[PDB]
Amino acid sequence: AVVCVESEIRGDVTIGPRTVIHPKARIIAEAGPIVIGEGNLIEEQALIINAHPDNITPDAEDSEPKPMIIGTNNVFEVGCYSQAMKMGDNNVIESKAYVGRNVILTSGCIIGACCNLNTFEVIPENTVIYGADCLRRVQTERPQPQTLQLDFLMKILPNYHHLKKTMKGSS
Amino acid sequence: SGNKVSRQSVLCGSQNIVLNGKTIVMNDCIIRGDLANVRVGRHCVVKSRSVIRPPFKKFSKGVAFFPLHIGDHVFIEEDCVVNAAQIGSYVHVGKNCVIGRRCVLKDCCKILDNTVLPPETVVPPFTVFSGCPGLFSGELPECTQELMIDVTKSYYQKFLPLTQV
Amino acid sequence: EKTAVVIDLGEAFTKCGFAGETGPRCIIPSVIKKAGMPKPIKVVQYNINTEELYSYLKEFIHILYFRHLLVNPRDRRVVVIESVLCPSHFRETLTRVLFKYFEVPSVLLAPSHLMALLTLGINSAMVLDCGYRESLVLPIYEGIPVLNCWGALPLGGKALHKELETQLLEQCTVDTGQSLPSVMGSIPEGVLEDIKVRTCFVSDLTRGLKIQAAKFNRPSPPPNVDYPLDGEKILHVLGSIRDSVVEILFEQDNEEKSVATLILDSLMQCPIDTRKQLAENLVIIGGTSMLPGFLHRLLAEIRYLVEKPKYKKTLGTKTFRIHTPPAKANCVAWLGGAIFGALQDILGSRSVSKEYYNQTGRIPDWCSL
Numbered sequence A: 001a002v003v004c005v006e007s008e009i010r011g012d013v014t015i016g017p018r019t020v021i022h023p024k025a026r027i028i029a030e031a032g033p034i035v036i037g038e039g040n041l042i043e044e045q046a047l048i049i050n051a052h053p054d055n056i057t058p059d060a061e062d063s064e065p066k067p068m069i070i071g072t073n074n075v076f077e078v079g080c081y082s083q084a085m086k087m088g089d090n091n092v093i094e095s096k097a098y099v100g101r102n103v104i105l106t107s108g109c110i111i112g113a114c115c116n117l118n119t120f121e122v123i124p125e126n127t128v129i130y131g132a133d134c135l136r137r138v139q140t141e142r143p144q145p146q147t148l149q150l151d152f153l154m155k156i157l158p159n160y161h162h163l164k165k166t167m168k169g170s171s
Numbered sequence B: 001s002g003n004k005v006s007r008q009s010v011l012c013g014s015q016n017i018v019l020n021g022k023t024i025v026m027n028d029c030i031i032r033g034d035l036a037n038v039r040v041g042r043h044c045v046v047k048s049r050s051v052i053r054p055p056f057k058k059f060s061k062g063v064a065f066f067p068l069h070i071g072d073h074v075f076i077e078e079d080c081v082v083n084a085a086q087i088g089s090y091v092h093v094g095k096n097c098v099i100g101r102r103c104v105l106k107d108c109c110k111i112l113d114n115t116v117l118p119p120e121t122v123v124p125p126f127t128v129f130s131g132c133p134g135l136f137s138g139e140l141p142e143c144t145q146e147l148m149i150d151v152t153k154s155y156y157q158k159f160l161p162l163t164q165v
Numbered sequence C: 001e002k003t004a005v006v007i008d009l010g011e012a013f014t015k016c017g018f019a020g021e022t023g024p025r026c027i028i029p030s031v032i033k034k035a036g037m038p039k040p041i042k043v044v045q046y047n048i049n050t051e052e053l054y055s056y057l058k059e060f061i062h063i064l065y066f067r068h069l070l071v072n073p074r075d076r077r078v079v080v081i082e083s084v085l086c087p088s089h090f091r092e093t094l095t096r097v098l099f100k101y102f103e104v105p106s107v108l109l110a111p112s113h114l115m116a117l118l119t120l121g122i123n124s125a126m127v128l129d130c131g132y133r134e135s136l137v138l139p140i141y142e143g144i145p146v147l148n149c150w151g152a153l154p155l156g157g158k159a160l161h162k163e164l165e166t167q168l169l170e171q172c173t174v175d176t177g178q179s180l181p182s183v184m185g186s187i188p189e190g191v192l193e194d195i196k197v198r199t200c201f202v203s204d205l206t207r208g209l210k211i212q213a214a215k216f217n218r219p220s221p222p223p224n225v226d227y228p229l230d231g232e233k234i235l236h237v238l239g240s241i242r243d244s245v246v247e248i249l250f251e252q253d254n255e256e257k258s259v260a261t262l263i264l265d266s267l268m269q270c271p272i273d274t275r276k277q278l279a280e281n282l283v284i285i286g287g288t289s290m291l292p293g294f295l296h297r298l299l300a301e302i303r304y305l306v307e308k309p310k311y312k313k314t315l316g317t318k319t320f321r322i323h324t325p326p327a328k329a330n331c332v333a334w335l336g337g338a339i340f341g342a343l344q345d346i347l348g349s350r351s352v353s354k355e356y357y358n359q360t361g362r363i364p365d366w367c368s369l
């Protein structure tokens, strides 16, 4: 993976292969061990979080001892954060996506612009939300978890592949 | 030389950038336009918290978004997470803007607050395209826009001197 | 030869386009666009300031021209479609706007029901207009409207919105993320319109009778789908309210005044000869008329009220039949005005010229002199 010197990580994060983190990739995985996936591209200005501390104060039996995870082809773009997103296969997060706490991001997840993810909501597969229309379950089969949106994600991943080699060569 | 830029910026590929004199850049603007070229002009301005990344590879198999472009005496407010926007002369972005991929924002444009332009969303000239999705909100004047952009270049070269060394 | 811009107003949605064009080019609502305006004030309003309506009409018709007409208001005629019984002050304000700021060649404050009749091509029918504000019946015989026979009821789209607001405010089961009622004191109209079209529907006649039995000592159809709402304020609509909303539209409440009863009342005031021809020619126009099952339940309600022992002895066995216009019921009157505007033969003499208004000021209306 492209372990960029500018990619600011924090804590024990046993990453995976092909997890090209771009410059200024501020993250945090200390209170929760976030394992990276295979085939993503952590862009600039991101924010990976782990175990929302006592500022919010979870006064509901804080005995978490649970680590975050990632998946394949789930490249998150700039602006968008990552508040412990239990992703999967090809769950791309576009610009300025306000990542929510308990959103088990399944496949075919196209996190649109300025779409604040729903806390404690099981993000099923094959669903792309609309921008202004929050929670729009539009394109139930067009944004299909496999062969349609994941195929488009692997197609967008090609530019990420060329950029992965280019960033590994430019550094 | 004349571009009295800040010192807490972030970028790579020193020659890939293009920022002529009398410009005013701000801090925390992580513009990683290293691979593809970054084009800008004179008396232009940008603001903090704006990670204006470059468009794309520009040399893919089929089509690919070119290096970059910007205009003279333009202004880009705070949190402008822009990406792939050829700005014309006297353009004017807004706060928390989101420039869509492959957007040739023509001259005398006017972006809005928290406006999320989609990919390949062409914006007309002297027409403030705005809203959440792409929408030609209203029609912006010509004379007042040119005077406001000149005043913007003036204020940018008359305020950047302090608190930036 | 020049065309004719057919402008049609409305409290909910305005319709506009050209002459001869099948269907208007755009249907923009009656809202405005202004800075510092959290809720755009409607252009079509009554019993309010004069100059305020003059400015509202100027800006709305201006943005209407320059955004959906792409033409200067001097090269082509204007046929302003306005329904009958419209307030004279509103018409005078429209005339002031069109002749003092735009300076059009000639306006024509033509009625709505008459051009709705022109769409079908026939010369006589009974027209029920289910507009936004109120319902309106106006019988037309041989191209002439029987103006003394009329009927209005505040049971248009506005009553449906009032019903939906009160009822959904009562059973406000907005889940968390469980009830949470009255979170907001008032809800807007856009969500209410979406609930009307996308979720509400017209029941059946037997289903309506079951709702009547359900009023006091059962709602037989229960289908419902939890309607979403932004900001995770997901509510849950009920399987019975989707029936009750139309039930109040087809309610009588011991006064014998429902939407369908208004046609029978106007048919009662019509002369003896015109009776069977208006029964053989029934036209249903208006925006509220686009509901699923509205025409079927409407005709069933008509025929159910035929054998009522209050209107049977004067009407009896009749052949009721509804016409099918070649356009959508929400935009029939506009198409009639479009066919009329595409008739440049006598419209130059039928409409009110600009010269006559500038040197006279008097506007033709059904009033003495």
Ligand SMILES: Nc1ncnc2c1ncn2[C@@H]1O[C@H](COP(=O)(O)OP(=O)(O)O)[C@@H](O)[C@H]1O
Residues within 6 Å of the ligand: C009, C010, C011, C012, C013, C014, C130, C131, C132, C133, C157, C158, C193, C196, C197, C286, C287, C288, C289, C290, C291, C330
């Ligand atoms: N496609 C549709 N299906 C059902 N109802 C509709 C549809 N379009 C509009 N409406 C209803 O029509 C009404 C608009 O009527 P309108 O023609 O504006 O009345 P007016 O005669 O005052 O202009 C709205 O209140 C809306 O509820």
